[PDB]
Design a protein around this ligand. Structure first.
Ligand SMILES: *[C@@H]1O[C@H](CO)[C@@H](O)[C@H](O)[C@H]1NC(C)=O
Ligand SMILES: *[C@@H]1O[C@H](CO)[C@@H](O)[C@H](O)[C@H]1NC(C)=O
Ligand SMILES: *[C@@H]1O[C@H](CO)[C@@H](O)[C@H](O)[C@H]1NC(C)=O
Ligand SMILES: *[C@@H]1O[C@H](CO)[C@@H](O)[C@H](O)[C@H]1NC(C)=O
Ligand SMILES: *[C@@H]1O[C@H](CO)[C@@H](O)[C@H](O)[C@H]1NC(C)=O
Ligand SMILES: *[C@@H]1O[C@H](CO)[C@@H](O)[C@H](O)[C@H]1NC(C)=O
Lengths: 48, 48, 128, 39, 49, 32
């Protein structure tokens, strides 16, 4: 193998389908999903 | 004599290339930035 | 990840620095000559001094030379000719030499190799 | 007189050696270069 | 296309295209070279081509 | 080993190398 498919999960849409209340609850949980987006970007660049 | 001059010129040029390049050592800086960012997020999360 | 890179750096040091590495495109691009390590904060930096060829001329080639019913093959290098005279030369540098019995080893019957080109080879022992 | 353009990649400068049954090219000069590897 | 170029380099130029400018090589001679690279002389290939 | 024509290959003009040292090399074919 040389690489895998590049996935670009976004926290807001995955964990809160178009719900502002859920979005606020996620936001109050702090920046737990910025790290997730950054890690996925890192692995994508790594496959490239 | 010729190869000695070539080697001296190349040794002179690598220094100027490292001086003038924006960041050719992006890997050490990359790991340093990664660790600093990870620690910074560890601290920042506590303010949630 | 850092330990994988550290193992790679240790192997690179032990091969390129403490000896010459025949592995192509391991210690710098091209044929490798030395490598001078340098220290860096939380890392290491090498100076892969590599040897790369230059201006090239294409002449002619023949896999073997048939002097007297027997094919001659070069002990090392190519059978090259600038158009009139056939020369044996080294691998990555043009050093033509007069074809003698020392530069070639004889084996065959001048009937099976494809691309054989007629010529004369010389000896030093008949003259003396 | 300046703008951002988009184009398909170029994988490199197009080149082609000429394989001939009796063609050998041998370099007559040589160069020394020093690269750099950072780990 | 990358792999096609990589393959065209390794059949018309031997291994030199991995080091410097690519130099054309007759393929029987390249095979004789590789044979020379494992301890058998060129006559083996030029006789059993 | 005694320096003979078998142990060495000759190439040059004795004017370009640095560190050249004079000596005599020998051959087996002149004697015979
Ligand atoms: C050498 O190769 C070049 C390729 O551009 C060709 O034009 C030329 O005729 C060749 N010379 C000989 C002597 O084969
Ligand atoms: C080929 O090389 C020989 C040896 O130096 C020289 O005498 C001759 O003139 C050369 N001819 C051509 C066509 O290059
Ligand atoms: C080479 O020389 C031999 C003997 O003189 C002759 O039989 C043969 O036809 C020649 N071949 C070529 C290609 O000149
Ligand atoms: C190489 O040999 C083949 C087979 O004999 C022939 O068809 C082709 O024209 C030859 N090419 C050259 C450049 O001699
Ligand atoms: C080889 O290249 C070097 C560097 O450009 C140059 O100084 C030298 O004259 C060249 N040698 C020949 C024989 O052209
Ligand atoms: C070596 O011998 C040659 C010829 O006899 C002479 O010209 C030269 O000066 C000598 N050099 C040394 C260092 O003895």
């Amino acid at each position: 193998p040389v690489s895998m498919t590049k996935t670009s999960v976004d926290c807001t849409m995955y964990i809160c389908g178009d719900s502002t209340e859920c979005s606020n609850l996620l936001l109050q949980y702090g920046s737990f999903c910025t790290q997730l987006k950054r890690a996925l970007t890192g692995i994508a660049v790594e496959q490239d | 004599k010729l190869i000695a001059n070539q080697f001296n010129s190349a040794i002179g040029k690598i220094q100027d290339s490292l001086f003038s390049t924006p960041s050719a050592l992006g890997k050490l800086q990359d790991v340093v930035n990664h660790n600093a960012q990870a620690l910074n997020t560890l601290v920042k999360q506590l303010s949630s | 990840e850092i330990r994988a890179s550290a193992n790679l750096a240790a192997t690179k040091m032990s091969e390129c620095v403490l000896g010459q590495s025949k592995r192509v495109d391991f210690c710098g691009k091209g044929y490798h000559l030395m490598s001078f390590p340098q220290s860096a904060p939380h890392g290491v930096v090498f100076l892969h001094v590599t040897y790369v060829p230059a201006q090239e001329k294409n002449f002619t080639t023949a896999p073997a030379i048939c002097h007297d019913g027997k094919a001659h093959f070069p002990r090392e290098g190519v059978f090259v000719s600038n158009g009139t005279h056939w020369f044996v030369t080294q691998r990555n540098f043009y050093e033509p030499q007069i074809i003698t019995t020392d530069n070639t080893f004889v084996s065959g019957n001048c009937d099976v190799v494809i691309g054989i080109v007629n010529n004369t080879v010389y000896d030093p022992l008949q003259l003396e | 007189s300046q703008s951002i353009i988009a184009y398909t990649m170029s994988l490199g400068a197009e080149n082609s050696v000429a394989y001939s049954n009796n063609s050998i090219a041998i370099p007559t000069n040589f160069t020394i270069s020093v690269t750099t590897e950072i780990l | 296309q990358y792999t096609s170029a990589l393959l065209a380099g390794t059949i018309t130029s031997g291994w030199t295209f991995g080091a410097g400018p690519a130099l054309q090589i007759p393929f029987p001679m390249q095979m004789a070279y590789r044979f020379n690279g494992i301890g058998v002389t060129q006559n083996v290939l030029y006789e059993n081509q």
